[PDB]
Every structure is written in structure tokens, then in C-alpha cells.
Amino acid sequence: LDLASLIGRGQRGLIVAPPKAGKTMLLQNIAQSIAYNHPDCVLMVLLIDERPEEVTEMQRLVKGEVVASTFDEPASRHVQVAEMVIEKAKRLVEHKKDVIILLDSITRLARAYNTVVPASGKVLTGGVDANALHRPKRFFGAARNVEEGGSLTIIATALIDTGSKMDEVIYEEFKGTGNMELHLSRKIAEKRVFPAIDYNRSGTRKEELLTTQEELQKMWILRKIIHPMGEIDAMEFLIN
Amino acid sequence: MNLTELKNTPVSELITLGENMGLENLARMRKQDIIFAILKQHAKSGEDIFGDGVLEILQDGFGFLRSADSSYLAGPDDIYVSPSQIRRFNLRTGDTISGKIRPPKEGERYFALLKVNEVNFDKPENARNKILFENLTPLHANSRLRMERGNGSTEDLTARVLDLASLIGRGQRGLIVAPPKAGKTMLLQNIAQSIAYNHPDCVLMVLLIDERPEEVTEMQRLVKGEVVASTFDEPASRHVQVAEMVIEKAKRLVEHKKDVIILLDSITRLARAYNTVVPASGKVLTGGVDANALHRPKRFFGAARNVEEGGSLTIIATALIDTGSKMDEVIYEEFKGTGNMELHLSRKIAEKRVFPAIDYNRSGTRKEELLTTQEELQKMWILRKIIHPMGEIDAMEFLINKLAMTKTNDDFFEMMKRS
Amino acid sequence: TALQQAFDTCQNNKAAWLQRKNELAAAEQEYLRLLSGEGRNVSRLDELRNIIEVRKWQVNQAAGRYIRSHEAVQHISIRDRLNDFMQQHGTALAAALAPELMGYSELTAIARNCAIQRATDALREALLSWLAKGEKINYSAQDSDILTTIGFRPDVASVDDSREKFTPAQNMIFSRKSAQLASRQSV
Ligand SMILES: Nc1ncnc2c1ncn2[C@@H]1O[C@H](COP(=O)(O)OP(=O)(O)OP(O)(O)=S)[C@@H](O)[C@H]1O
Ligand SMILES: [Mg+2]
């Protein structure tokens, strides 16, 4: 529940969910957990291009300010609210104060950038511009910890398997750049923890004759660590 | 003698009135021109008469007033609205105005407006101070739209089927997805006449675009509420301006703490028309559709909401599925997930002629807890448990079978629980 | 009061059913005549076939409504006769039925129902015995003429013209077809 328990202080993180998986109330619970457990930190709930009633519910069931953009207006509103929230976050960093950002959703912001960014000829499979990639990279890497005083941290929300093709490319590049990524659905858990790409690469050579410790480096530890819920197992991918 | 009475009357009354008092060769011109000419000739006696219609403002400051029976068409029947009227009665688009009209003197062709006597079915003076729609606060669909008609046909059986499969709320935002030849138009009928029979208090509005003329004329003579429809013969701008003016008129109506329901068939056609008419932005997606084109129908759909302090705006819009054209998909997943409820249909159920063809498992609603009570929520959840296992066609056959012998939905519930 | 209105409802329903019957017969003979004739009016033949169909459905509906009205008339007559006979001989019935009819108000619902069904069965054997000895039964003198006009059973044409069963989807599509044909005939 507590953000320090889940996201800690100063480090970025993601949560990824499919449609019809329980996003709104989970974000609500995270919001009041932040409000009660750490009232000192400045709450910041943000929404992009979703139904106005849920925007009102979010901004009415929490205490922090909720700058949100409903799904009526075009994506220029979304992009410019993105720069202005990141600039006010930077100002609060210069203000020597911790902030928490609940953004929903980064896939929405990314493909809004994709459909708004001017054409540059660097498109890829699916017409994804490179600018619409490293501008989100700049926004997502601006969430670095403050080493001089205080600590900014953000919790990310992403949507998966929405019946489209644009979302999984940005999902896999977030996987490439992700710090921690909470998961809800079934298959993508195994997709991440046991990379099918790496499994196929290994199986192409079958049991590769890894000499000496190279074979023993790949280790898997399951420790039934003590948890307040009671004996929640923790599984770790030990490498050399 | 208002414009509405002679506008609504058929050709026989028009030609009889023309030949009675001295109209020559009046049978060979378009009906709007006929009513214009005959009403001008009658008003040449200087008798002020009442008027009715919906106003709109073009690029210039001058405004026009149209009639509902004319399918919101710009023609000779249009009524002048001077900008001075806009200032002196804070007029904005979509306001329904009733008042004395002015016969045309030399220099003008149409009819002006002498005075205003009823603005939005209300006194013009007390409506000067009013709350704008922009700052209104959205809310959930707390009020259930009980559309169970209880008349005693299999059409009522379809009504009960979507009662048991959907939760229609007052002020919600709904999407319907179905393949062609599945039962969309008369499902919308079901909705229309069920609302008319069960909820006469709320006004019913049915918007039809690029539909066949026979469907339009059978829809106009079947629904109790007023219906606006523009066929495919007219260009894209016709449909676009119809949709804009009707949605903003519903906005003005719901601003008066009124319950407005708009049945749209379809929304994909509206998106196609908007893409056709909108200037190109240079950022085209798959299927020849650019980015900014989809914004307009998409804010159009987003206009639906429920007002906390009074009034509700419900939009039930249909979306085409698997028609073989890529842009139909493009719109399908562009609007997917933006509605308070989704209603899915399958063509294979219609192939075996089991009707309706609603996919029970796929159909769903958002925030059922606030809309209904806990007891009926669990009572529908247990049906979801028992009907989820077998196939959707088998599910519908089972449901219609053991619902045919049952008079109402409640008795169906207490007849299932004992089993 | 109720019997008179029910009787006139039944008689006008019968008149309407006869009207539909002869309309269907006229349409059928017209269609047969045009089929026999050399004239090759395919469109007229299809139109007449549609007329035959819709007239058949209308005859079925009229027969069903007339049957329902006849049953309602008979039920009302039976109820009135039983009500007045009971007002006459309630004590006489209760003298025989007392062993399980007294204390009806104080008996519980299941006991009330079991006593009711026991008396029901017993009077059923009484009726079958009375019919076994078998006199000639006659109408009540108060309302004899209405019942003899209505008759003990409806016409066999009414019952066999309603033999077929139509799903109410077919009933409503036929309602639209009949409305369209009536409008066309009026035009
Ligand atoms: N409840 C019902 N009662 C009667 N007929 C029904 C019912 N449901 C479906 N049908 C039949 O379904 C057929 C197709 O219905 P339509 O509403 O015309 O299909 P559609 O989904 O509107 O697609 P369009 O309008 O042709 S593009 C008709 O022939 C109807 O008779
Ligand atoms: Mg249709």
C-alpha cells in the first residue's frame, strides 16, 4: 500500500495492466496510501484522455491537486500539459521539496506524441517516429532522484493488449528501460521474467556448452520471506 | 397560425390551401419553397404569426433559424436572426425560440422575427441569467433507465434481454458494436419506444446519418419523439452540420436541467464524414484518415455526461464492425474504451436467426455498483455465473427459452433462484 | 350487466370472424380464377398470394379472439350461476361439508388448502355420480337465450381455423403487412 513500500523514494517505476483489470480504484488506493502514510510529500495525480466522470471522481476522492485532461480535447492539450507539469515538477525540485506523481497513462502520452510529432522520416514498423520515442525518453528520465536534498518519485501506468499494435512496441522499449514494473495479467509476467526471446536464442543452440561458471551463473532462488500478509514468496534471478 | 402546423401537414393540405385563396401552379415546386411562397402570400395581409425552430450562427454575425420537420435543412423556410437579437437576448446556437415573425418587406427574401415569446420552452426574460455547459460537473448515471416495456411480444423479449445483459443509466455514455445485418436499427427502435413508453418525462432524440431513405421514413413514423435524419444522398457537410447543431441543441436542452437521450446510428459514418470534410493535417494514419479528423466526432461522443445539480445527457451510438474497410476498424479502436458501457453483437447468432444477437459475455457496463442496489447487483451476478459457462448462442437460446414463459424480469429472477 | 356486454362482444367478434372468412374466400376464388385464366399477370398473382396469406392470418386472429370471448362469456355465466346458487343454498352445502370446512378462518394455510382440495375431490365424485345417473341438462331460465345464442361449444370452423400456431414475431410482421394492405386498399 505505502509508496515507500512499493516505489520507495527517488526511483522510478511502472505498473502495467490490460483493459478491464482494475486500474482506477488501484490508483485511488495508492493515492490515499500516499496521503495518510506520507502526508509530507506533495501529492500529484495526473490523467490523460479519459472519461470526465472519472477525472472528477479522482479529483474529488483525493486531497492533492489533480491536473487532468479529459478525452474531449485534442492531443495538443495533452502534450502541453505534459511539458507544464514536468516544468512545475522541476520548479518544485528547485523548491527543495519531495513530490509524487500518479500519471495515467504513459502509453496514452506516448502515442499522443506519436500522432502529434512532426514527421521526420525516422519512422519504424507501425509508423513510430524516433522523436516520439526520445521525447518520452526525456520525460521519463527527468524522473531521476534528487541527490542534493529531498527525493522526487513517480508511479507510472501503462495499458497492454488493447487490441492494437502501437502499444506493445512502446511497452517493450519500456521493458528495455524499466526500473520496476508491476504486472497484473497472466502471460506478460512469464514474458518478462522468462524472456521468450532469450529462451529461443538459447534453444537455437540447444543446451549451449557454457564452460565452467558460465553454466552455474544462471540461478533461481525462491525464499518464502515473512510478509504481513503471511509467507509471501520472493523469486530472484541470480546471475554471477 | 404558426409555421409548424402547415409545415407538418401533407401535400394535400398545402395544395388545397394554395388553390383556395389564389396560388397558381403551386404543385410543381419543392415543398419548402411551396410553404415559403404560400406563407409569404398569406402574410402579405400583415398578420403577425408565431414561429418555431432551432437557431444557428454561420461565419458571419447574422444567424438563421431552421425547422425540425425540414430535417434541419437550409432553404427558403429559414428565418432571419439579426445579431442585435444575439446581444439583446444573449442568444447562442441551438436555442429553440418561439415568437412573432416579421413578413418580408423590400430588400429581403426570408422571414425575420418581430419578437421572442418562448426561449427553450421558457420565458426569455428569466433565461437571461443561466449556467454555461462548460463548467458543469459530470457525475455517474445514478438513475436507472427502466426500459422494460412489458407489452407482451418477442420485441419486449429483446428489451428484457438487454435489460438482463445491459445496465442503461440516466446520463451514461454507451457504444454499440455489431456487424452489418445484425439488428442495429430496430434495436435502436426498441430503445426509442421503450424510453417513450416507460419514461415520457425525458425527451427522445434520434439522429440518423447516411441511411437509406426507406429506413428514415419508417423511423420517422415509428418513434414518438422527434427524429432527425439525413440520408446518404446529401454531401458530407450536410451530415456534419446536422450532427453539430443537434448535439449543441441537446447541450442547450440539458443546460435547463433536462433529461436528453440521443440515439446515433452510426458514429463511424460520422467520423468518415468529418474526415472527408476536415482539412488535411499532413499526419495521416492507416486507412487514409489523419489525426485531427477523429477529434471532432470523438469530442462529440464525449459530450455525454450526467450533471450533478440537474439534467442528464445520454448518448447511445452504434459503431460498425468487420465491414471489410480498414478505417472502420481505425474508428473502432479509436473510440474503444471511451464509453461508459459497451454492447456487442455477433453475426453468427443472427445466421441461425436467434434474436437479438447480443454477446452476453462481451457486453458490460462500468460502475454497476453506484447505478443499482447490492441485492439486484448480486442477483445479476449469479445469472452471470450461471450463463457464463455455455456458449453465447446456447446462452441466448437458454435465456429466451426460459424467459418466454416468464412475464417479467423479476419473476424470472425468483424463478431461477429456486432452481 | 356483465353478461349483456360479454354477449354483444362475442356476437360482434363472431360477425367480424365471418367477415374475414368471406373476404378470404373471395380472395381465394379470385386467385384461383386468375391462375386458371390465360392472362399472365405474375405481379398480380404474387399480390393475390400475399392477400391470401394476410387474410388467412387475419382469419386466424379473428377466430382466436372469438374463441377467447366465447370462453369469457361461458366463464362469466358459470360464475354468476354459482354465485346465486351459493347465495341460495350456502347453509345446505355447508351442512354436508362441515366435517372439514368449519374453523376455516382459524386453520393454517396448508390445512386450509388440504381441506379445500379434499372437498374439491369429494364434490368431483358427487358430480360424476350425478352425471352417471344422467338426466337431460338444461340452461338456467334467467339467462337461457344468451347461452343458447352462444351455444355450448363454438363453431368447428373457429377451432380448426385456429389450429395452426404462429410465433408472435410472425404475428407482428403480419400486423405490419395487414396495416400496409389496408392502407393500400383504402388508397
Ligand atoms: N427481435 C426481432 N424481431 C423480429 N425480427 C428480428 C429481430 N431481431 C432480428 N430480426 C430480423 O433481423 C433482420 C435484420 O435486421 P436489421 O435491423 O435490418 O439488421 P441491421 O443490424 O439493422 O443491419 P442493417 O440496418 O441492414 S445495415 C430482419 O430481417 C429482422 O426480421
Ligand atoms: Mg437496420
Side-chain angles (χ1 to χ4, degrees):
Chain A
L1 279 74
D2 193 13
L3 73 164
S5 295
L6 277 73
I7 201 64
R9 265 212 174 200
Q11 65 272 18
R12 65 194 71 186
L14 284 75
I15 81 179
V16 296
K20 190 68 70 177
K23 281 77 68 179
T24 61
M25 72 291 291
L26 190 148
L27 292 175
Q28 291 176 335
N29 293 120
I30 281 176
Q32 73 258 10
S33 66
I34 288 154
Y36 293 101
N37 308 334
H38 290 104
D40 57 355
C41 184
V42 175
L43 186 57
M44 197 159 165
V45 178
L46 188 147
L47 296 187
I48 307 184
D49 186 74
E50 70 94 16
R51 66 182 64 98
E53 194 279 328
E54 285 292 323
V55 159
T56 61
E57 189 183 84
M58 295 299 102
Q59 67 185 357
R60 194 255 297 171
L61 294 183
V62 301
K63 64 90 176 179
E65 61 88 20
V66 189
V67 55
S69 298
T70 182
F71 74 90
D72 287 316
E73 69 275 16
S76 311
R77 180 67 175 85
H78 300 319
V79 307
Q80 63 84 30
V81 72
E83 292 84 4
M84 62 80 71
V85 299
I86 198 66
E87 294 294 328
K88 74 165 72 69
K90 182 63 69 177
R91 187 266 182 275
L92 294 175
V93 171
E94 306 319 300
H95 182 241
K96 180 67 174 66
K97 183 67 174 67
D98 54 353
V99 298
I100 175 64
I101 292 170
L102 278 65
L103 188 153
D104 180 22
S105 78
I106 295 88
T107 189
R108 178 70 274 172
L109 186 138
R111 66 182 177 91
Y113 282 2
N114 187 312
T115 187
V116 176
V117 65
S120 66
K122 298 296 183 181
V123 289
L124 295 174
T125 60
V128 177
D129 192 0
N131 298 52
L133 294 174
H134 65 279
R135 297 284 74 78
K137 299 289 94 175
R138 186 268 187 189
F139 174 79
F140 182 76
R144 81 292 183 276
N145 190 359
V146 180
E147 66 274 15
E148 60 88 20
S151 284
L152 72 90
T153 199
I154 69 170
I155 193 66
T157 292
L159 277 296
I160 62 170
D161 80 15
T162 61
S164 74
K165 188 269 183 182
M166 295 298 102
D167 63 358
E168 75 266 16
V169 173
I170 59 155
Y171 181 89
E172 61 86 20
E173 61 86 19
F174 291 167
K175 173 67 174 66
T177 198
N179 186 277
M180 61 79 71
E181 312 184 351
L182 192 149
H183 284 69
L184 290 176
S185 70
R186 275 69 174 174
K187 277 75 69 177
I188 297 89
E190 293 83 3
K191 299 289 94 175
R192 152 210 182 201
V193 298
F194 292 115
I197 295 169
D198 179 62
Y199 180 77
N200 299 339
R201 292 181 184 173
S202 188
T204 300
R205 273 72 173 175
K206 293 179 179 179
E207 291 178 350
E208 178 64 26
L209 282 72
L210 294 174
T211 311
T212 196
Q213 166 81 258
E214 301 323 289
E215 260 300 296
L216 195 61
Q217 286 156 347
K218 293 182 183 293
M219 293 177 71
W220 294 264
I221 298 169
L222 189 150
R223 289 154 158 123
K224 291 183 183 293
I225 193 66
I226 296 91
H227 190 272
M229 278 177 54
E231 295 294 328
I232 298 307
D233 56 65
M235 182 278 288
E236 304 165 359
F237 294 98
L238 189 152
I239 302 299
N240 65 8
Chain B
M1 183 278 288
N2 201 313
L3 174 58
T4 300
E5 293 83 3
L6 73 165
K7 177 61 173 171
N8 192 31
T9 57
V11 185
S12 70
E13 157 63 38
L14 268 297
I15 60 170
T16 300
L17 184 62
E19 64 90 20
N20 282 327
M21 61 79 71
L23 270 296
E24 61 86 20
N25 282 186
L26 187 65
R28 296 191 302 274
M29 294 182 286
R30 292 183 291 113
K31 182 63 69 177
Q32 189 174 184
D33 189 74
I34 301 302
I35 62 171
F36 171 73
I38 191 166
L39 189 152
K40 182 176 174 66
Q41 167 89 9
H42 183 302
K44 287 181 178 179
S45 73
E47 302 166 39
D48 52 351
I49 58 172
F50 263 118
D52 269 322
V54 186
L55 62 83
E56 69 169 4
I57 299 101
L58 282 72
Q59 293 81 8
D60 53 351
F62 175 79
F64 282 97
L65 190 141
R66 309 279 155 74
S67 159
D69 291 331
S70 176
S71 66
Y72 291 160
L73 178 52
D77 188 72
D78 297 10
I79 291 172
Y80 302 130
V81 176
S82 62
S84 66
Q85 310 194 48
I86 310 167
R87 270 84 66 188
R88 70 175 188 268
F89 282 88
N90 69 13
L91 296 178
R92 64 183 65 88
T93 318
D95 288 320
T96 69
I97 319 293
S98 315
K100 300 289 94 175
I101 68 168
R102 187 183 70 77
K105 68 189 174 292
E106 182 61 33
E108 77 271 17
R109 281 82 65 193
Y110 292 165
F111 275 66
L113 198 68
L114 282 177
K115 199 66 176 176
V116 295
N117 279 335
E118 214 169 30
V119 165
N120 296 315
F121 317 95
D122 197 14
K123 187 65 69 178
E125 293 82 3
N126 67 23
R128 293 182 182 276
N129 189 348
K130 189 173 175 64
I131 300 102
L132 183 63
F133 183 82
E134 304 320 295
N135 41 40
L136 295 184
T137 45
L139 196 57
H140 267 301
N142 308 332
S143 177
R144 174 67 181 272
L145 269 172
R146 182 76 275 171
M147 61 79 71
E148 187 181 349
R149 74 186 49 189
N151 64 5
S153 71
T154 78
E155 199 70 27
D156 190 17
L157 188 153
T158 298
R160 296 158 85 210
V161 162
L162 73 164
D163 285 328
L164 272 297
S166 178
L167 282 72
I168 304 299
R170 192 184 304 263
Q172 75 190 13
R173 178 165 38 244
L175 264 169
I176 304 184
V177 285
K181 292 175 181 175
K184 297 184 290 294
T185 57
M186 64 182 179
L187 197 67
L188 268 295
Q189 289 173 222
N190 288 318
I191 301 299
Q193 64 258 9
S194 65
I195 290 171
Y197 181 76
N198 296 115
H199 312 268
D201 51 342
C202 60
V203 297
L204 180 62
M205 294 177 71
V206 180
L207 166 67
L208 296 173
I209 54 183
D210 63 358
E211 198 70 343
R212 320 157 190 79
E214 62 271 15
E215 315 268 9
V216 165
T217 189
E218 62 86 20
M219 185 64 72
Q220 293 179 356
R221 68 176 57 252
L222 190 146
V223 300
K224 178 57 215 69
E226 63 89 19
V227 54
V228 57
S230 55
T231 70
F232 58 83
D233 291 331
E234 301 80 335
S237 67
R238 186 75 170 91
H239 310 125
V240 161
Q241 63 85 29
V242 161
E244 302 275 301
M245 182 179 72
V246 71
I247 193 62
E248 61 86 20
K249 170 209 172 188
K251 206 175 297 180
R252 289 303 94 80
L253 214 51
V254 73
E255 272 190 354
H256 270 82
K257 304 172 183 52
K258 272 284 196 170
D259 284 350
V260 292
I261 295 92
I262 297 180
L263 309 187
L264 168 63
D265 184 14
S266 164
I267 194 156
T268 64
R269 316 302 295 172
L270 194 53
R272 288 175 71 260
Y274 272 105
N275 170 42
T276 285
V277 68
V278 70
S281 59
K283 178 58 162 293
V284 64
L285 294 174
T286 291
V289 180
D290 55 353
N292 60 3
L294 310 181
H295 161 250
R296 299 294 296 163
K298 191 277 164 172
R299 186 269 186 189
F300 187 106
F301 197 53
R305 51 175 51 89
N306 173 29
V307 182
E308 304 177 351
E309 64 272 17
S312 43
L313 165 52
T314 307
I315 293 173
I316 312 299
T318 74
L320 269 296
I321 304 299
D322 63 358
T323 47
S325 56
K326 277 74 69 177
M327 73 291 291
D328 287 11
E329 283 88 5
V330 173
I331 295 89
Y332 174 35
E333 69 274 15
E334 190 277 331
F335 294 89
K336 182 173 72 175
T338 61
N340 284 357
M341 61 79 71
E342 294 293 328
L343 188 63
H344 292 234
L345 291 87
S346 69
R347 65 179 177 88
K348 60 96 174 181
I349 290 192
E351 292 294 328
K352 277 73 69 177
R353 299 174 183 81
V354 186
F355 296 124
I358 299 182
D359 202 299
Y360 196 45
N361 302 327
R362 293 180 181 177
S363 75
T365 309
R366 294 315 301 134
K367 208 69 69 175
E368 292 102 346
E369 300 89 4
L370 303 190
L371 197 151
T372 55
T373 64
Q374 184 178 2
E375 57 92 19
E376 69 209 68
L377 208 58
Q378 183 62 255
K379 200 66 176 290
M380 293 180 183
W381 259 124
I382 60 169
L383 268 75
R384 290 184 183 271
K385 311 282 193 288
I386 63 170
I387 301 169
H388 176 45
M390 73 291 291
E392 67 275 16
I393 184 166
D394 292 331
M396 199 90 84
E397 285 159 288
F398 161 77
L399 198 150
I400 62 170
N401 189 359
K402 71 183 294 294
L403 186 65
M405 61 79 71
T406 303
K407 300 289 94 175
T408 59
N409 302 352
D410 52 62
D411 185 34
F412 170 59
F413 280 129
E414 292 83 4
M415 183 278 288
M416 183 279 288
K417 65 177 73 174
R418 54 91 175 172
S419 296
Chain C
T1 61
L3 212 63
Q4 278 297 141
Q5 69 98 48
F7 169 56
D8 58 64
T9 293
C10 187
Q11 70 184 356
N12 63 57
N13 280 7
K14 178 170 182 103
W17 173 63
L18 271 296
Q19 184 177 3
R20 300 321 176 186
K21 285 207 73 53
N22 64 280
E23 280 198 345
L24 166 65
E28 182 65 26
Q29 64 87 30
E30 182 65 26
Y31 175 78
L32 187 61
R33 180 197 64 86
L34 273 187
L35 263 191
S36 52
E38 190 276 331
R40 186 179 66 192
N41 296 114
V42 187
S43 66
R44 191 46 185 184
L45 281 180
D46 291 331
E47 187 71 14
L48 292 176
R49 187 179 296 112
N50 189 359
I51 297 303
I52 301 299
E53 183 178 1
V54 172
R55 291 321 193 203
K56 186 180 289 293
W57 175 86
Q58 277 178 316
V59 170
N60 188 10
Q61 292 299 319
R65 269 179 278 91
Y66 158 80
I67 291 317
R68 297 292 185 271
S69 175
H70 174 292
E71 294 294 328
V73 166
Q74 278 198 344
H75 182 74
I76 289 303
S77 75
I78 291 296
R79 188 205 54 199
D80 186 74
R81 296 297 91 192
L82 280 180
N83 208 283
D84 81 18
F85 165 80
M86 185 64 72
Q87 194 67 42
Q88 176 57 42
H89 295 132
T91 47
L93 277 296
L97 275 297
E100 69 275 16
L101 268 297
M102 294 182 286
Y104 178 39
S105 301
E106 53 87 22
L107 278 177
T108 187
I110 60 170
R112 292 181 183 174
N113 291 319
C114 80
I116 284 161
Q117 277 71 243
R118 269 190 300 280
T120 298
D121 306 334
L123 62 91
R124 192 190 304 274
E125 293 84 4
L127 292 176
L128 62 83
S129 64
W130 174 272
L131 189 150
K133 64 91 175 179
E135 70 276 16
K136 187 269 183 182
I137 189 67
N138 189 359
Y139 278 139
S140 166
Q142 183 177 2
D143 291 331
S144 290
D145 80 13
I146 293 170
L147 302 176
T148 187
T149 51
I150 299 308
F152 162 62
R153 276 298 174 264
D155 291 331
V156 65
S158 288
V159 65
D160 63 358
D161 288 351
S162 277
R163 179 66 179 86
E164 72 287 4
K165 182 63 69 177
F166 293 155
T167 190
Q170 285 176 291
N171 283 309
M172 66 186 87
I173 191 167
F174 272 101
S175 69
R176 270 89 68 187
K177 288 182 178 180
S178 64
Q180 186 262 327
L181 291 178
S183 64
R184 181 178 180 273
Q185 186 173 355
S186 173
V187 163

